[PDB]
């Protein structure tokens, strides 16, 4: 629903360290200025009341915005990177295998036997997990996007199919 004060301080710590790393580049210089930055964060580590702690956070965020690197380093496969979402053109959904011609499938008998096993699993487990979702969701509906584990032997975690069978990160 919201981020706690600790969470926001940690996010700013990580972001400021990464932009410091983008500015410093060399590892020794980054280590030195990173320890200095950690000292800055440790100065007010135990602050009595949260009003001035939040004011410190506001001042730190204004400083970060002023001093941020215009182009920080971005991991290539992370959002905004040079390889970000490069592999979506290969992520074919698993339902396309049903529309294969019977002569395409016959080249892969063992795989499609295993696929029928998984399909039978999914078909069989579906009803007892909609049930568990009903028996676990309080009146008024869900309050958080969290999902339960399977609670009894033989059952599968509800709504598991598209998480478990999702396309690989390097499919094709």
């Amino acid at each position: 629903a919201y981020l706690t004060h600790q969470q926001k301080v940690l996010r700013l710590y990580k972001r400021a360290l990464r932009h410091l790393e983008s500015w410093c580049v060399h590892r020794d210089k980054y280590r030195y200025f990173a320890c200095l930055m950690r000292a800055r964060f440790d100065e007010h580590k135990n602050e009595k009341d949260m009003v001035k702690a939040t004011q410190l956070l506001r001042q730190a965020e204004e400083e970060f915005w002023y001093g941020q690197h215009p182009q920080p380093y971005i991991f290539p496969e992370s959002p905004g990177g040079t390889s970000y979402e490069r592999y979506e053109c290969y992520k074919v959904p698993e339902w396309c295998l049903d529309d294969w011609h019977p002569s395409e499938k016959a080249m892969y008998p063992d795989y499609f036997a295993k696929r029928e096993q998984w399909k039978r699993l999914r078909r069989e487990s579906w009803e007892r997990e909609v049930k568990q979702l009903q028996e676990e969701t309080p009146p008024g509906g869900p309050r958080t996007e969290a999902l339960p584990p399977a609670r009894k032997e033989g059952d599968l975690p509800p709504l598991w199919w598209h998480i478990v069978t999702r396309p690989r990160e390097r499919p094709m």
């Binding site: 410091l20 500015w23 060399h26 210089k29 200025f33 182009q71």
Partner: protein, 165 residues
């Protein structure tokens, strides 16, 4: 290879009846090309490894080596071969002052040295927030930030609000 065109180009632009500002700008850009070549070499090749620890460096492939080799031999000898085999399609600049003859070399050397001085400073244990000139250069003069947001927004907003609705 670049000496048999670019150096003559600088010689011709220095010797012509030209816009003075354009002459100054092309000379300054001739310094800046040495500057950014210095940046590439200094950060990619010099110094210490800054890449993840799992070292996968492997340039031993015949396709890579051979294609880069062919264009390397081109980059070394192609200017001399083509300059001496085409006929003279111009008149040459045979007489210019010595400070004008070495202008291109002098400006590229200046760019090399100044970029080397600035790049070496990044090793110092000092940290300063960027200047506004750095911000103008790094964010590309803010040309994409302005011209990819303002005209497109107004065009699309009009295309809905006034054109369609």
């Amino acid at each position: 290879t670049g000496f048999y065109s670019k150096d003559l180009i600088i010689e011709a632009v220095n010797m012509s009846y030209t816009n003075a500002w354009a002459l100054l700008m092309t000379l300054i850009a001739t310094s800046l090309t040495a500057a950014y070549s210095t940046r590439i070499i200094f950060f990619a090749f010099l110094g210490k490894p800054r890449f993840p620890p799992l070292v996968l460096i492997n340039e031993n492939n015949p396709l890579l080596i051979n294609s880069i080799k062919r264009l390397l031999i081109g980059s070394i000898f192609a200017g001399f071969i083509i300059s001496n085999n085409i006929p003279p399609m111009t008149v040459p600049n045979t007489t210019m002052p010595l400070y004008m003859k070495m202008t291109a070399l002098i400006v590229t050397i200046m760019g090399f040295m100044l970029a080397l001085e600035l790049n070496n400073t990044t090793y110092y244990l000092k940290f300063k927030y960027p200047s506004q000139t750095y911000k103008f250069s790094n964010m590309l003069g803010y040309y994409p930030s302005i011209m990819h947001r303002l005209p497109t927004y107004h065009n699309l907003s009009m295309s809905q609000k006034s054109a369609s609705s």
